[PDB]
Amino acid sequence: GSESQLSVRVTPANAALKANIEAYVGSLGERDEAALQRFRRNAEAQAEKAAQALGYFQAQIDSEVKDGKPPKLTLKVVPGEPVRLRQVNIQVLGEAASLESFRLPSGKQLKPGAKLNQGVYEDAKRLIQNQASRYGFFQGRFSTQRLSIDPRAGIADIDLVYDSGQRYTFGKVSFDGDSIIEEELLRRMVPFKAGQPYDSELIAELNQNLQSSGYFEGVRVDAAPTQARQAIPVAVRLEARKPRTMGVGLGFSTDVGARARFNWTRHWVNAEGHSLGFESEISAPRQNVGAWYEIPLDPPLTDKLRFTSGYQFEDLVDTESKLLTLGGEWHSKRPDGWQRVVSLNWMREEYKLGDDSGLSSFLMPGIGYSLLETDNKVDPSHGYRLQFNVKGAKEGLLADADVLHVDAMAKGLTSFAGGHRLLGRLQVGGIATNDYKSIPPSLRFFAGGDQSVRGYDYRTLSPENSDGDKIGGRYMIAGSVEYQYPLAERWRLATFVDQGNAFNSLDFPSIKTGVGFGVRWVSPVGPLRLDLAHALDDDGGFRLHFSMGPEL
Ligand SMILES: CCCCCCCCOCCOCCOCCOCCO
Ligand SMILES: [Mg+2]
């Protein structure tokens, strides 16, 4: 201690007004009677601002200042009935009058008869000007912005007439900078054609496009407007990235432990925008190395070819595997957001399941679909992810066995009330075959872990053989529901239930259940999560899970 507690008395009770006054006055701070006495005129001023802000203008307040441990100041507030809107005229004229997606100011708070709330007028004004600016009505004017308050007789009039004038348009797109990327390529990632209606979110989209292309270390995408129609030219300057970039990352997980990730990427090999890359990751239970080549199709960023090769060693609970892979991928995304990937992958796997050593190889075609819909990036308000992937093989036809491998995931997040979050997770997997023994670990299914079924260690939920070794399931499911309570900014308190298992028979899934609670912390890289989970099934003890990365 000590800090001098603020006190608001509203007769008769009005929680809204009270909380507003409390927010407006702010913190009294530490001591004292005298300092509080000086603060009184400010306190009454702020309080009456808050009343005026909620429509109470025949607001009559009184300050009281008491001393003690700590001190305190009691404001008595009394609110004459509020000022209700009589006339409200909100008009958007000009070209904007005809724009479909131009939201007119609406809602309960701007209806006649309603108590005047702080900034509803300004909210409306801000909305109009924001959409004006988004859609390129730069010659857009407020012909009329009148707010009238007669506290007495309790009347308020709103008048917003907004002449938007003519709409500007996208001009030429120009590219300068030490980039060797052909303008043929750069123009196919401009998300607009010339003579098309201006949209600042399209400029943003272009900026993020160029940034995400990997081609540069910097882009200056600017389209400032011009005087009193025209056509706003867009200037893009590109700094070719250093031709060979290196990156190193450290991470940790309960699943795999300490982890190191490295990448050494060439972001442009030639003028046609081809991309080269290498990457590896080292952890005690798993080490892998990969190389890749990418060819932008059209659009370059959502449609592409990706060739890959890889080697991976893995020693987990009762299984070992050296896995070699080559592959070709074709990414294409439709306007929904549905990204398809058509693949042809060859794999050879040297493995030890329990004490039984195998080696098998498959050439499998596959098709996948993905969908990601979020509020944005670093933690979003609400969103979801859908993922579907099928691959298969015919023995004889470059396959040691017949295979129909299917895996699917669904992730979801919603925020409601004052920031209460709900998280949902489902994952399903299945492999069909006429030779299960020939099926290597990578094609089998495992469960448990930070991102699977908490309360259980990584990939430990699995069928066992004669001697009690975890060998892998033909199918698996893992689901989770989590509730998050905002405790502070960047701080949340979660409770969760996960259920899942990997198993060979649909009739006896023997689903295991872990339940628990943890802490979420929003760092700048991402949401770190630390959970304490109790296994309800098998012989359940307690388990600490730790993980890094986005919620979705
Ligand atoms: C478009 C929104 C996408 C979000 C979908 C979230 C799906 C989350 O579902 C959680 C329930 O999953 C079921 C888990 O099943 C485990 C085994 O069932 C219990 C058997 O005893
Ligand atoms: Mg160029």
Automatic annotation (TrEMBL):
Instruction: Report if keyword Membrane is assigned.
Output: yes
Keywords in alphabetical order: Cell outer membrane, Membrane, Signal, Transmembrane, Transmembrane beta strand
> Boundaries of each POTRA domain copy?
168-227
Q: Does the keyword Membrane apply?
A: yes
Q: Where does this protein have coiled-coil stretches? A: none
Q: Domain TamA POTRA spans what residues?
A: 7-79
Q: Where are the transmembrane segments?
A: none
Main localisation: membrane
- An example of a Pfam family matching this protein is POTRA_TamA_1
Q: Record's family?
A: Belongs to the TamA family.
Fill in the subunit field for this protein: Interacts with TamB to form the translocation and assembly module (TAM).
List the protein's name: Translocation and assembly module subunit TamA
